Symmetry: C2
Subunit: 457 residues, 2 copies
């Protein structure tokens, strides 16, 4: 009776970032011109939103943290997965196997630059634990399978607190998860009974050394959890470091008078980013040396034509690295053979231009082993997704503050972001969301969509 | 296509849609099996170009922006003709377009941005198109910003000088007005400077009959109406402890100041509002943005100030009707003002009502009825607030020296698009913003109850 389902409307809502009253006015104004099979009522959309939420008795929103009980979240997901299977009349109901993925990561944030003058409340540092469902197995066969195993569209939020990622809080979160994992592991839906097998694979290198108290093969033709956030930042930094040394073109600035003009070049480029782009590109807040958020790296690659004029780097190289990071962070399906050729050539262009600066471990793992990592669905979006939430609460806090107190508006923000994270990671809602945002449509390059083989023009 | 490019462009403004929100909205609407809905953004952008006057006086500096009204009137006349049902007006030997003009200034507070951020805007409104004395076209919203054509806005504090400076600078371009041309008809222009308050009139020159309601002390500025009523309510709130008009008295000043800071503190911990904060010269630099938030939540403001909630919402509903620019049910408004007035004396007969509150409640119906409400000012404020947002977006991809003009360039255009006669003819009766904020009593006064 309506072109857009209430759930499909909710998709269009997220894909466009439309407000409640923009959608109501969009509806009314589109009716008054003679067509009502298009959009449902917002009453129907609000109900579709409510259907994504888990029960209110399992959701803990403080002025600090936010937590869902892992039992409640898995059961919620199972139900919404069944509503996307073509004919959920499966034969094995004695046992279904839902294979799921989990992990955690942390991101930082800065609201312009405001020291001794705070623009609101919030630690500007978020720590999020997430879960992703992978395969639905009955007697050894695939019944339903995740179409985007590394997209944030299936990155369910479990518990995010606005705390810095300590070695302790990592171990604290592992045992806090392992216990609620090791304790309860059943589920029920639509007559079938579903057990859960969880794998902690959304983990980077530093977390692994924590949990244990503690190499290429020489790189054959004839590897770890790659964070989208970590890839985007450590490549910007690698490109910046090359830019500072363009005067002498040597990896080590240890030589006679090289350090003298590296700092000279670095200050020229730092100033160029501030007045040409309003970017604090390498400005340090004494937190071991590089307080560059994912926001800073995102804007460093947003305009390859301009970053090259600022840094003195080659535009071809910069655009190549940006297109790659876009494909990674989209969460969409990447044409692995088409990607490997693009990565293999980007590497060739690197040594063509800057063979003197050795490739960072992150750049090596990206360009040289990135094709395989994509192919084995081993890319971790908790990082970038955790940051995008932080940017979105500080936005919500500045909106709620105008009619609520600080301690109350700070929780109304944690309440709303948990919801926004649930709708966006909902299997039935994500089942009909556009392959690329209005944001992704505007920003992604010609080469990027070509790598994603997207017919979502 | 269901939406015309101009009608889509209206939907664009009414929703505050970005270029890429509209493109994705279109694509996503096709991908679900329906094309006939929205036109291309190139066709929408072409419609935007059609509102602009030529390179004749695209004058956007790092400071000001100005259009010659000859180019603007000819522009307006042409866009007015595109809205008449049957332009078979036989009498074309002389057409009389009667238009309205004036100017007003607004201030602003928030220094990280660029700009003096105090704006002074001169605007023009077309009223009637006369053929041999007969109505050919008539303004459907004579006080709405939807027909408030911008002539020149400079970022200057409204000085005594710049008023007279603007008066003769406008007066000269008047006598030099050649009759406009469109569709074989010849249109002469008669302008009246009535969008003017009492302040401007005493400059140019170097009352109640014992009250009788069934210009009217010059009219009513929407910007000044919201501020001078908020301030009147606050002054009542500060003196609630002793219930006397005079702030003098035995230690009254001591507890009046105590109440004023109590309420000022409530408006910060509850609302993040600077209610009477001064940055220059022992003053009361309350923005039009500040008055909008003072009335946005009458149930909450009343707990803060200790005032009667009914009264606050009543004053808010009225100021919303005034500022909407839409047509107000004059008989239904007069009854609403005349009852709000009764409620005022019911609660606070001890505080004499300010002249602005008197003019509104007692003479406001008639001022509405004679379309004597001036939106210059609030429009200048919404423009000023909208440049600071473009500056914050353009700066993040452009230098300051260019972003300071790219903002002035874009704001003049959006003031033109919003004041374009053909676009406003098919614009939604009330914004997406007005949907969320306007109260039931407000919509009923505009009689938009079912839209
Ligand atoms: Na508005
Ligand atoms: Zn290797
Ligand atoms: Zn009177």
């Amino acid at each position: 009776s309506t072109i857009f389902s209430p759930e499909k409307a909710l998709g269009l809502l997220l894909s466009l970032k439309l407000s409640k009253w923009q959608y109501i006015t969009l509806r009314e104004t589109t009716i008054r011109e003679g067509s009502k099979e298009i959009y449902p009522s917002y009453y129907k959309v609000q109900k579709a939103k409510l259907q994504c939420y888990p029960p209110k008795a399992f959701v803990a929103v403080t002025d600090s943290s936010a937590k869902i009980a892992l039992q409640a979240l898995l059961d919620l997901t199972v139900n919404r997965i069944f509503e996307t299977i073509r004919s959920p009349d499966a034969i094995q109901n004695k046992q279904l196997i839902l294979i799921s993925k989990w992990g955690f990561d942390g991101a930082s944030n800065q609201s312009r630059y405001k020291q001794n003058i705070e623009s609101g409340q919030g630690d500007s540092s978020i720590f999020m634990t997430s879960l992703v469902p992978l395969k639905l197995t009955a007697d050894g066969d695939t019944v339903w399978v995740n179409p985007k195993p590394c997209s944030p569209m299936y990155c369910r939020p479990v518990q995010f607190s606005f705390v810095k990622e300590t070695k302790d809080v990592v171990i604290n979160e592992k045992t806090a998860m392992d216990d609620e994992i090791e304790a309860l592991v059943p589920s029920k839906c639509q007559g079938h009974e579903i057990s859960h097998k969880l794998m902690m694979t959304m983990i980077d290198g530093k977390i692994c050394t924590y949990l244990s108290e503690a190499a290429c093969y020489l790189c054959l033709a004839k590897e770890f959890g790659l964070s989208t956030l970590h890839a985007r930042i450590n490549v910007m930094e690698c490109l910046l470091h090359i830019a500072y040394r363009l005067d002498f073109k040597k990896w080590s600035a240890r030589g006679e008078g090289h350090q003298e003009l590296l700092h000279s070049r670095k200050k020229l480029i730092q100033d160029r980013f501030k007045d040409d782009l309003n970017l604090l590109i390498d400005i340090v807040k004494q937190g071991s040396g590089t307080t560059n958020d994912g926001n800073t790296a995102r804007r460093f690659f947003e305009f390859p034509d301009k970053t090259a004029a600022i840094t003195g780097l080659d535009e071809d190289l910069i655009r190549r690295f940006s297109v790659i990071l876009q494909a990674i962070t989209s969460g969409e399906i990447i044409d692995v053979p088409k990607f490997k050729e693009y990565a293999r050539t980007t590497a060739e262009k690197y040594v063509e231009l800057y063979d003197w600066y050795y490739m960072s471990s992150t750049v090596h793992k990206l360009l040289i082993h990135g094709g395989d990592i994509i192919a084995e669905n081993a890319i971790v979006p908790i990082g970038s997704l955790s940051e995008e939430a932080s940017e979105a609460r500080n936005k919500d806090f500045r909106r709620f503050r105008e009619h609520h107190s600080r301690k109350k508006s700070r929780q109304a923000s944690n309440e709303d972001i948990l919801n926004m994270l649930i709708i966006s990671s909902d299997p039935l809602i994500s089942f009909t969301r556009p392959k690329l945002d209005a944001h992704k449509r505007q920003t992604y390059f010609k080469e990027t969509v070509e790598l994603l083989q997207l017919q979502d023009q």
